[PDB]
Write a protein that binds this ligand. Sequence first.
Ligand code: HEC
Ligand code: HEC
Ligand code: HEC
Ligand SMILES: [Cu+2]
Ligand SMILES: [Cu+2]
Ligand SMILES: [Cu+2]
Ligand SMILES: [Cu+2]
Ligand SMILES: [Cu+2]
Ligand SMILES: [Cu+2]
Lengths: 457, 457, 457
Amino acid sequence: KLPGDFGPPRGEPIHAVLTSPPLVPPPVNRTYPAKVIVELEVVEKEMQISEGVSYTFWTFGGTVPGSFIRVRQGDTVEFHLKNHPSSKMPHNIDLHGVTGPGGGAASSFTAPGHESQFTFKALNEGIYVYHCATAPVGMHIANGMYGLILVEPPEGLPKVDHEYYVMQGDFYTAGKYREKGLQPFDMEKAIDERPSYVLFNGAEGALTGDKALHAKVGETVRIFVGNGGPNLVSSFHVIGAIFDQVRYEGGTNVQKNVQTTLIPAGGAAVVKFTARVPGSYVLVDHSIFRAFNKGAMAILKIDGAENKLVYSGKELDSVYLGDRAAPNMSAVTKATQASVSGTLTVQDQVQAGRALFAGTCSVCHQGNGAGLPGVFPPLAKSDFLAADPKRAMNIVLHGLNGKIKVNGQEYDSVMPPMTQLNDDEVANILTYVLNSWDNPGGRVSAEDVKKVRAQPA
Amino acid sequence: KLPGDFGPPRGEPIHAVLTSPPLVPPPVNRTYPAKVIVELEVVEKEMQISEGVSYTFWTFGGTVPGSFIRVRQGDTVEFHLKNHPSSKMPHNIDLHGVTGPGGGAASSFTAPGHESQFTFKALNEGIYVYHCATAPVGMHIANGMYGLILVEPPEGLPKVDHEYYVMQGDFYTAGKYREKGLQPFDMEKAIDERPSYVLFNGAEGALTGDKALHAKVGETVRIFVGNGGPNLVSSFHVIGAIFDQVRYEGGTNVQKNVQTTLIPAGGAAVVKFTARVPGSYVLVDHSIFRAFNKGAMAILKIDGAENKLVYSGKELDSVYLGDRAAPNMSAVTKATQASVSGTLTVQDQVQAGRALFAGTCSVCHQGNGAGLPGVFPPLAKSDFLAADPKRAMNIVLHGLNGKIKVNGQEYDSVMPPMTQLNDDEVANILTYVLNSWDNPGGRVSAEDVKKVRAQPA
Amino acid sequence: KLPGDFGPPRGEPIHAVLTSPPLVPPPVNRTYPAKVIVELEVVEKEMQISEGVSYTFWTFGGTVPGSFIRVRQGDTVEFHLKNHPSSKMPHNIDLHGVTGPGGGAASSFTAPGHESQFTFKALNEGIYVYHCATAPVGMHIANGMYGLILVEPPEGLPKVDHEYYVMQGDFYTAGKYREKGLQPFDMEKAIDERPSYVLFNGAEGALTGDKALHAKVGETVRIFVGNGGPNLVSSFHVIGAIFDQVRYEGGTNVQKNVQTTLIPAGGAAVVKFTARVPGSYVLVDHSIFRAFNKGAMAILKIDGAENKLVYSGKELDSVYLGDRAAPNMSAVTKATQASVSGTLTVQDQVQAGRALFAGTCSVCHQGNGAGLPGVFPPLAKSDFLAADPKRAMNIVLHGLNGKIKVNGQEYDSVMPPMTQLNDDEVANILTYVLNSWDNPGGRVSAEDVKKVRAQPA
Ligand code: HEC
Ligand code: HEC
Ligand code: HEC
Ligand SMILES: [Cu+2]
Ligand SMILES: [Cu+2]
Ligand SMILES: [Cu+2]
Ligand SMILES: [Cu+2]
Ligand SMILES: [Cu+2]
Ligand SMILES: [Cu+2]
């Protein structure tokens, strides 16, 4: 006997309503098996992978991850895949959870401007990745072609206050992290499993700041967590909290009371969180350079009353979250645009640099540039800075050590090099500093920094 | 009290019968503990890791993975390791599941032409990796020195229709993927965990096409799945199906109803599959560039009646499986041999290119070269191709974009670069195309391609 | 209702006594919730990451991993973080298991010479990683800022004979593995997840030889195992044994009877071992090049009577453990020091080379240099060696193959290149060989080897 043996479809055919991340369709709330018609369209389009960084994504439904599909175990799914006429590549789909060769792949092969369909019975309850299955498969997945399908148990999942949709991916650009412009896919980096970005929901900042997920103290939150890969395994973790439950795919096993859980490439899990004290809870890949150097952080922000008996401390700030503590970094997008257009102003640079200074520089120099007398020198009204802005470019790129005098006080410490910052980033940060705190004004250009990078002091 | 406390060996000594992958010895079918004599011989020998690509493997029993060993919990195992006289290196063994230092390693040290033996009690039921334990251990394991030992529970495992033996490994060649010739081991790639091949059972195609595993609709299949490493963790997955059960080593935990499962380096699992609808089910490492760019795919092919109520779609084809959809790629081996011998004919190239065109080119241009008018230009009777075969070499290596006219129709799309193809591969593919579909004939040589690669248009 | 709801703190405030690795504080042995005051001080200091290789570690409590903290579920923890005045960087803490944003991070931000404190309730039983949470977070963690906190269940853990503390980390030096001197942190290697060292407890050899963990036949051993990362996932394994139990963090799930288990980056587990036969049991990351090429091996040495019915074989030796079979490699530290001071003697080199010869060379040439006539040529009284010591440098770096005659006998085999050995290592090994076994004496210098490396034969 096959699983999901609930009899023939009954009632009326249902046209599935799909949702865009980070939202989820409502519970199916149904006691009978149905014929469910799913319509999904592939769209190839440029989007911002980071501020001022464009990428040609290939998408199911216009988003990365693709639209969320929700059905019931025992349903008959008539799956329609359309490929938008603007596409250049053919596409198809493999849904995990499908019983049949390729998960649908042969029957869903769809050239630009065409449509395909196939039918399958959802035998398997669980949360499942779906993805493109078109040669070269890794290129298609790396370009964003993945999402989740939930096959509910017949009785439905337990009710919760919120349901969200979060999916990790690894991305491979020709340029380095935060290098501006339209970035091609990089096959060599992909084969070597050396991503430039590791993201939730298709972009840096997709789920941080003003795009955070929300709930209130006392509420329950279910997150459907995918790992589209193509290549990485996520050490998936919530900072400052615990998962009540973690369940992989449709497995019988449920782990309870864990904070860190490994999600295979192509894997998916359902996690549950109970909000206990207010603040921001960070979802990360705890392979830490991914989370803190490549974009792999998302936020669940909890509103409500503090409970000092449980936690006396403060909300997260830029020391830990860096430049993602703030609502957004729109000023960086604006400055990059203005550079392209040849209209970059001092103030455009100042505002971009203000955004980028947070964490990156403020951890030591403070948000007001005051530093800490004798320990971290000031950037505010800094004689040392004013005396030689080219030296300041060298200091950011190449670090500084040894005894120095700043505003009448000796320092004898170490500023690490920050060579991973791009030329525009150094330029904008220093222009911000120069135009703040009674510093002398003026500006530093990306070309100025390019020259210092090519010939260090 | 020790585990496996079933009393002294009884009956007669048993000479274990070992099997070569992908086959498994029969169930032990025994209710008493025995003395089991195991004889395993190390052989160093060249084998084909891919078509036309030789590698010096170091093997237990002549195969990668090594011979499968099957005993019963509570048995006393007298383990004999022989090192063939032709070997250049000493070798030994560490069997996971052994209770004792090194898993046998010190007592099994065996120089070329020698034999060693040691005895251990199998206290631990489970599936276990064994491997060489000779400095430099990583070199020995990377060269193929790993296999599985099953220690059955006293009552035996439940009966199934088929049992198979599949083992992943990561391999490190000096040359790139599919670069022909005898490829040395590459220590630098190994230390960096940057394999050139990721394989099941020691070779590309070892379990695809005419070497697939088989079963019928309704049957149960147990697979003993190892990960020899040395370095990679497998996001082990079955495309288009689900695992009824996954059990690691001898663990108490059994996960049920999962599709994707993480197998540690040096780990092993027993998975169970129930065949429900016919077609090819792909075992992969779902770190996708391994599966689709490095060889990490194996096939379980199911025969029987379609069930349209469960899955209406078609069997897998080259869109998803690429050049492994076909029974084999023997023509590539033959062409490579002929190149070495200086006897390479046009037809040798044509047949090799025919094999390599599948998926790689046919996904867009179709198996008949017709393309799709206005969307993917034809290779069949292509004026554009005929007009400039050196341009065609550049197009394969370096891609093509922009408006073009082919056979009277405008195209305005993007063909990605395919620079990872080796010179012989480009040459053979283009020679196939030129000699098909009313194209003008002639040939492209590997040297022709080498020159275009050294100086792009 | 919140977990750990055991009522208000009672009794007297408790000043936690913290332990340095590999030791653990005693069981709390308490039936009431308490206020527990924890005092931890950050110290930045140079330590030896390997013999003759210094590194500037950043530490919680002077060690890597940091001091072990042990409390009871339901306790109120008043956490004090001090930053030693000698520090150059600010620091803070995120304790997994804390319920609150950042796990403590915002409220624990501490400049050099300062102190911070915050209070949290330990709601969550389990073993948990703690680490620094200061931008750039990956740099801080890579420099050693991680440890474990145990939150006991209210009834305590079951009693065992020994409890130990073992924590894996990945490290990123500018220089290659075993390159001597003070090694800077390497940001590029860190971002790429390409460590030069993978270690237990902060150094090569930290838990090998005379620093092994101990127990006796029949005893139980609990190990609190952390993975500080920052980036790697451990295929954590015990050679020659099995784990009775593995439990992650505070999870409900407990796996029993497994040998190989995946520990996420930032993860922690409690494992249990029962000693059955004497010898050395190796804890490794079974991504094997880590264990055998980067330092990721630790030893649990069991004393007591052999049981030939369970295991007839011998204790581990240098064939498997390599140069870590011996008690220590102090001679390498001494020789490196003497080179720095310009006082390096022949005997300093000889003793360093003796240490390094084990495994590395002895696997084939034997500990006495005799080789195996006709199979592995002798280094003892070797005419071939004496005839040309520059050829001998080339042989170590670049390998040797083909027919040769040594001491009147023909060999026709392959010695692999050993190019990963550093110049001082080759020099010291060859000086050892030259000064042993009736060889002619003299010495080989690091500069001699540098020249052969720059121009191979
Ligand atoms: C702590 C880890 C720091 C971070 C992050 C940044 N800086 Fe820094 N900076 C730091 C120290 C300890 C020092 C002095 C080094 C010494 O030799 O004692 C400095 C110095 C500077 C200076 C020059 C002195 C001055 O004008 O105060 C400049 C211009 C400067 N730092 C700039 C700067 C910027 C823009 C940063 C973000 C990109 C940044 N620093 C980070 C410590 C740390
Ligand atoms: C889809 C992703 C493709 C794959 C895979 C391959 N080709 Fe292609 N090719 C494709 C397009 C869209 C185009 C036109 C580009 C444009 O500027 O509009 C092409 C073009 C060619 C040509 C030249 C035109 C012609 O003769 O039709 C050649 C010779 C060609 N392609 C060859 C070729 C081969 C041999 C491939 C496998 C190695 C291959 N292509 C793959 C799209 C795609
Ligand atoms: C086995 C895998 C070996 C290891 C490890 C090392 N050596 Fe070796 N060595 C080996 C062989 C098979 C040969 C002969 C190669 C052939 O062409 O047949 C050699 C040779 C040497 C020699 C020259 C001959 C002699 O004097 O005996 C030297 C000087 C030598 N080997 C040194 C040496 C050292 C110092 C090693 C550790 C760094 C080492 N070898 C490792 C096999 C193996
Ligand atoms: Cu696609
Ligand atoms: Cu998949
Ligand atoms: Cu071997
Ligand atoms: Cu092993
Ligand atoms: Cu720190
Ligand atoms: Cu953490």
